[PDB]
Design a protein around this ligand. Sequence first.
Ligand SMILES: [Cl-]
Ligand SMILES: [Cl-]
Ligand SMILES: [Cl-]
Ligand SMILES: [Cl-]
Ligand SMILES: [K+]
Ligand SMILES: [K+]
Ligand SMILES: [K+]
Ligand SMILES: [K+]
Lengths: 391, 391, 392, 393
Amino acid sequence: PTLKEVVIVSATRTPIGSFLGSLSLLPATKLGSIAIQGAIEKAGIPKEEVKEAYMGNVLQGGEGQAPTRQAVLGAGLPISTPCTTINKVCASGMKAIMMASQSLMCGHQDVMVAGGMESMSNVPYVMNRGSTPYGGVKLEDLIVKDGLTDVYNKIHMGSCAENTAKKLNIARNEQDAYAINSYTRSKAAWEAGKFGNEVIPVTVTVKGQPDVVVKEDEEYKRVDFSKVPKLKTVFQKENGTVTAANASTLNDGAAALVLMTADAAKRLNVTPLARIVAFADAAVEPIDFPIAPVYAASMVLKDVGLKKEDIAMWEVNEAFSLVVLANIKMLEIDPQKVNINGGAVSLGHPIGMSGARIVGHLTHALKQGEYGLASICNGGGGASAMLIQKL
Amino acid sequence: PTLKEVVIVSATRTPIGSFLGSLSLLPATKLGSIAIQGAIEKAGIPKEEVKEAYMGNVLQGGEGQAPTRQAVLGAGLPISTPCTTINKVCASGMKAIMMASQSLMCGHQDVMVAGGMESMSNVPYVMNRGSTPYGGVKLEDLIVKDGLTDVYNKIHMGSCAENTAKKLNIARNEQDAYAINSYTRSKAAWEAGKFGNEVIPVTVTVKGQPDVVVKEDEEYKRVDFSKVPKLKTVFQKENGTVTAANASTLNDGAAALVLMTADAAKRLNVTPLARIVAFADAAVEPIDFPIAPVYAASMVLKDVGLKKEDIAMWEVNEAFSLVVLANIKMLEIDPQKVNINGGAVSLGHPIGMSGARIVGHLTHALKQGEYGLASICNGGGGASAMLIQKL
Amino acid sequence: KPTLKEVVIVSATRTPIGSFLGSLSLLPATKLGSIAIQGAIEKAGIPKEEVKEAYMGNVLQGGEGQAPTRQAVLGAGLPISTPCTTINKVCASGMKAIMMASQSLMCGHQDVMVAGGMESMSNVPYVMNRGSTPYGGVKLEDLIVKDGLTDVYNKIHMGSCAENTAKKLNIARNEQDAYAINSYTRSKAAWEAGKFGNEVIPVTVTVKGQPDVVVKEDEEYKRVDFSKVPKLKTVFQKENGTVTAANASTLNDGAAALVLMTADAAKRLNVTPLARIVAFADAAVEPIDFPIAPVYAASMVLKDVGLKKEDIAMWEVNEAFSLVVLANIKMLEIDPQKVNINGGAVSLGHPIGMSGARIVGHLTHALKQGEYGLASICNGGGGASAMLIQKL
Amino acid sequence: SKPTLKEVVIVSATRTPIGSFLGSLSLLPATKLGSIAIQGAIEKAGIPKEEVKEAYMGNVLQGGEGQAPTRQAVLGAGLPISTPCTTINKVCASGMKAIMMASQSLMCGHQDVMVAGGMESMSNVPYVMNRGSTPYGGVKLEDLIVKDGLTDVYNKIHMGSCAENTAKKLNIARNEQDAYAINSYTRSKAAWEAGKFGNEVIPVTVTVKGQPDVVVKEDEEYKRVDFSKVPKLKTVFQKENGTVTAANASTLNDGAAALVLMTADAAKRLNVTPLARIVAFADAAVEPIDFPIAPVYAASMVLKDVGLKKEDIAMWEVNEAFSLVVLANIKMLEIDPQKVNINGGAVSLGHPIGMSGARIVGHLTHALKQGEYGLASICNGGGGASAMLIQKL
Ligand SMILES: [Cl-]
Ligand SMILES: [Cl-]
Ligand SMILES: [Cl-]
Ligand SMILES: [Cl-]
Ligand SMILES: [K+]
Ligand SMILES: [K+]
Ligand SMILES: [K+]
Ligand SMILES: [K+]
């Protein structure tokens, strides 16, 4: 049998909440359920049609058994739905979509949900099993230990990024200009109503207090442009460039897509939003993660036979402003086509979610016939990339 | 393009260590490295031929960033190798092989490594992020919270087993006889030298201490048959059936397979061990996970037009003695063909590893031309299954 | 019968009492101690170098660092030659400190001492046992609950022990609630009347990048709603309860310190003493029966000096629970209008190591020349301390 | 004018064996060891339990012991519920300060009979987590032995690190310290084998269900040494030019001591033979880093107060917190080393910190001959010391 064609029929997300902020009372799995239910409703299909589900999720500790199963059953999908939780660090939300697309291509399912989720607010601390050492011990923060420290270099991702800043001569002022640009694009996009088909609101309910309706991203309002060039370079004391403002932040969120074969969309009288054309993974030295998305994108372009000029919009995940700048520079692409409506530096980075969010954003924002290319770096030196065409 | 045929070229595992036992000093990722290196060596190929790696791993908290990447880089594979860590609870090791097979089928890669790893000895305790409540702070055990507790019913997996024992009328004495039979068959297989090609020895090195070489599974010797019928029923104190002897145990270990397209196997002139014929996932009501493998197994047989009599060897993961008995009862298959060389009740159950182990064991044990079927239940009500044919 | 030095109080000063996790919660108990000690020496009008030795009550010492009293004393700018001892008689600690200091002075072993109490319940930690973590997890215990508030022998809270006395003496919820509202009413009236002008010193809380906060009065007494008082649920006993959050004492932060000296030393230093310490005693009963131990301790002191209850102008019976004060009133048969007249621990709060010192300090200021004041304080384990002073 | 005080005598002094850290007595909480010593002392004194009027116990690391540690020890020994109790903390000096404060009450005539002593279970001291919000990046669990017991607040370093400062100042080298340490072990073994603690120490039965009873009858720590290894050990408290080692410093331990104290009049009334009279005592303090020299001043204060000369003292007990401390005291006071710590001390017997001040006073009581004077001194964290002079009856 030949490979099946895969289409995106809907793509939906929660707003992104700030660390210990507006969505911090909700577990990752509950945000998961909200996004999945929303995506199914938007697709207009019976929920029974969804055959299987993959969700990205990096910091699974303390979330309870089978996080994807919790999200799926919490969304009211049938108990017959198999579930798998995916961890490619920062690339998790994209890799879930890629893996689901592989199952569909093989004809192993005809309809799936794929996406990502993360509640950094609820990630716990850990104590080693065993006897306590004389003199005491520090219980580690799993955001730091599992999420943000490179194993091999024993330093923060932010300190790894400094290496690329040095090698490619990307200065503090340029990184700060990029970050201000992201905040500006995010605000403009929200004010133009550009997220109306993408984001669904969340109602946070507390006993004995009034409901809070969270309807937009929280992070992009937390900025003061006049203070941006005043911040300390917290990942490197001497000759540093990366700051809290020009780096991504810690956040909570979930996103979900309904994926089908072309045959299934036809059978169900669904008009799909976009076609999944191709995808790829690349890896380089762990310290050099900022540059892996260049190679992953180049792989996809070469596979399909497109030139960079053929791409209408780029989503290069804003793990740090430095990452986007390194990518624009190496690929020599028009900066006006890159992260047009903001990104992780200003919208925030719930790590397991962002790779799904950026694909969902292209699905809504591209115009008919246009190609969009999303790419996302990950801890350990990896990246994933994906090319879609709007239908 | 047409779908590619997938073959298993090698299948290797560490011995399985007991909880806080012979392998407890090694992190899961290090066991992973050991199995991966061993599988590549047994396949007779250069490490550079391995294109991408997926490993099952359920309890990832505190292991550090990107566990699969740590396993792969730790085995000396190229920095160019993309890695993804897979969590379908107890089914994780088999689902990793299934998902890698799908990538190979699509022609997206030609050689991959897939398997699973777990060090339950090193799984930590957690403390919640936030304000310390008045009156005390609880530190939860991630083995219990994420590993072994059903979310929806708020009971241990062993209490779900008790529920199936009720519904299917599977008694304590029946579960005890099965367990004694598992311990018996494990010892017989080790004595017969049946793991000589499957298992590779682990050298444990401690500064200022003599090297310890771990060459065989630890768990199967930890039993007293005279005491089996006297043990307390820990999941249900009154009229119970499940005990520590007749349930699987907590353990440490890793397993890894080298998988290739038929075309790659020919190009590299390797001798494949088995072909992957079919695989499937099923899911049922969470409390009924013991019976999910019955549906998964039925799906694979129907998919390829084989009847249950056509299967020479069954591996139904021994999560509990109850599970195997339930499967035999529903499928009406010959017990003499099931878990013939022991299983998880007597060999142990490093949860993310077991689904890979049982597929590897069929690859070694089957005679040329024979079909083997492996199935494995998972927390949340799921199961995975795979059918292979020995070459 | 021994011939002893006469012991006088020259000053008695305290911080305001802060609410749990409230206005003074950023300050360690030892820092509150330094503030009270410095304040009392200033009020005494003596050189810091004249203080020979220091004793401080402090019940929950875990995580405060080595030698809490030493930290408070050196932190107050007293000489490195000053010996220090930290005292623990649970709730009675602040009073027992004064008693033991008085005993050294009587023996002529020192001529001038500082004695008091300190507690920061906001900063009391949780504990984890030494050893290996059990499979399945563990609860780390709260030291306020484990060391401060739980009876060892009955394995229940002090509040539950108090329910026992409520039963035996027929002291009902209504009477307890009425006593509590009275305490809150009296605390407010005293604060408004400026009755704490000489006793309390303000504390300035400083946080980098934020404005200063001057805490100049007790925080707790304003945290009440009289309308809700009779509607509160009984936390220590669901079945036939009487004790509630409102009519029991609360968790709090504060410190108190008194400058004590021999009558001779006061003359040498040309300072006018405020009061004379006449007598003091400890008593104990069954652990569960701690509410009634103060009756026996007070009687011992009266019998020792040969006075009668009517001779006492002012009583301070520590308000650990409203129940406690009512039990004492009933058994002693004293005039409730002479008891805790300017409020107490039910409305002002109860930093456990400090309250015993606070109540003696209050008598010192409030008594009129020539009058006798009796202070008594129950403690965890079935104990009580009591003290008689006479205004000078 | 000086007050006219009652005379105070020691009628008994009893202790548990001292257990090693996580060693033979580690299953027993401090308060239980307290109960055993308190019952011991009463039984030895030959008086009814109801005669004891009030109790003071030294105890430095009280976290997690439960409410009112001294009350627990007392009620656990079967004393009347009518017995008032107070727990004392002068760090390392606690066990001696308890006896002094009880002596002051008796002198005043406020009680006629009391029990005073000290207790510590370092094996059972817990770890702590702070109340509040968990800070991003991790949460510390501190060891209370280190945080409350052994760390100087002001200098932010270990007691042993402060000790190095006096080693420097008084030129006391590694070899002299090691010689002292070996001397302590030698004395301890000699005394134990001679049966010198026959009336001082009482045995402890450890019961574990299923296990055979363990009877701990002698001090555990003194056998834990190898003299050939002593000179080879690393100086763990200072990188450069260190002198303090695990071998020549005191160890972490468990134990309790209790003394029955009464007025001369009560001993007559009760027809019991007093062991010693408590003559004088004092507290001294210096710069916190200089705690090893504090006992020098406290001892001098006592001798000056009673009008005695150093030469008049038959037996000295200078607490062996560190070998360094004893040598610094031998140096500054210029006393006869053969008269100091005759039957061993904390370097070889161990240092359950709230107990040790009581143990050493209890030791003089048993060891002195009729009419002899003994001086006991003990340094404490923060730069203090207590000292006591007694005379055998
Ligand atoms: Cl990767
Ligand atoms: Cl599932
Ligand atoms: Cl008491
Ligand atoms: Cl001191
Ligand atoms: K930012
Ligand atoms: K078993
Ligand atoms: K209250
Ligand atoms: K030693």
